[PDB]
Amino acid sequence: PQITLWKRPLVTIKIGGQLKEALLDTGADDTVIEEMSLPGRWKPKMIGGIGGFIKVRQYDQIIIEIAGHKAIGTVLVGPTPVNIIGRNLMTQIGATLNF
Amino acid sequence: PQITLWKRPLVTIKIGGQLKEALLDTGADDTVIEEMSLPGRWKPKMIGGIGGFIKVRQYDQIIIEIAGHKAIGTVLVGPTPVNIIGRNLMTQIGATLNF
Ligand SMILES: CCCC[C@@H](CN[C@@H](CCCC)C(=O)N[C@@H](CCC(N)=O)C(=O)N[C@@H](CCCNC(N)=[NH2+])C(N)=O)NC(=O)[C@@H](NC(=O)[C@@H](NC(C)=O)[C@@H](C)O)[C@@H](C)CC
């Protein structure tokens, strides 16, 4: 679809079999989801944002559906202010910025 | 133009008579630019995301050019690790997400 930016680019996602809401974020390298129970092996990771760094659990090769589109990649689970879908997965669903 | 997401969507902008490189961030409500001595009245403000909040100076009616596209709106100036173009300006250059 074509999504304008007058409102936050929020979309429904399916992860771990659970429906969640996430922000399509072109300014995020990675995908960061709020703390949740996710089937998979993970390893400690640290990421940065506008005000500093936070610790997250890095889960590799996670199957996830974003607005009806499938992607299989790295998902970071931690205390993020908001669920964000980063470029790592947006590239998988063929998302581009256009103006 | 079309901007893929294989790498950070960085564009050249012009603000305060200076040229800078900024990240098109669909996950940012506002525009945060690195510390610069902009002329005029401003309002104290705090903005946050991953890592926490940072103190910024809110400047209104700032004329800015993004990737050759004119825009005018609110610009927050402060200790940001990266120049961020948020939705408030991206909407003005008619930028959309497509997949
Ligand atoms: C979590 C909040 C929603 C998404 C977020 C993403 N912002 C980008 C901007 C900074 C880019 C460096 C970001 O943090 N991206 C991270 C996301 C985490 C991630 N791992 O992908 C990133 O790419 N981090 C890279 C590092 C960037 C490298 N660049 C550099 N160091 N200069 C990483 N860790 O690999 N938005 C924001 O940070 C904006 N906040 C918001 O839009 C809202 N604030 C809140 C708290 O929700 C609004 C109510 O103000 C900021 C800029 C204020 C307007």
* Contact assignment for B48 to A50 by CB distance below 8 Å: yes
Which residue has the CA at smallest separation from atom 16 of ligand 1?
A28
Find the A28 Cα to ligand 1 centroid distance in Å.
Answer: 6
Cα separations (Å) of B96 from A56, A93, B41, B62?
A: 30, 15, 32, 22
Using a CB–CB cut-off of 8 Å, the residues of B that contact A are: 1-6, 8-9, 23-29, 32, 47-54, 67, 69, 80-81, 84, 87, 90-91, 93-99
Q: Which tokens belong to A48?
A: 């940065």
B82 near B20, Cβ under 8 Å? no
Q: Residue B48: helix, strand or coil by DSSP?
A: strand
For residue A69, give the chain B residue with the closest CA. Answer: B99
Q: Classify residue B49 by burial, with Cβ atoms within 10 Å: 0-12, 13-18, 19+.
A: buried
Q: Which atom of ligand 1 is nearest the CA belonging to B28?
A: 42
Q: Residue A2: helix, strand or coil by DSSP?
A: strand
Q: What's the domain count of chain B?
A: 1
> Looking at chain A, how many residues does it have?
99
A49 near B49, Cβ under 8 Å? yes
> Which residues constitute the domain of residue B83?
1-99
- CATH code (residue A61): 2.40.70.10
The amino acid occupying position A30 is D
| Method by which the coordinates were obtained | X-ray
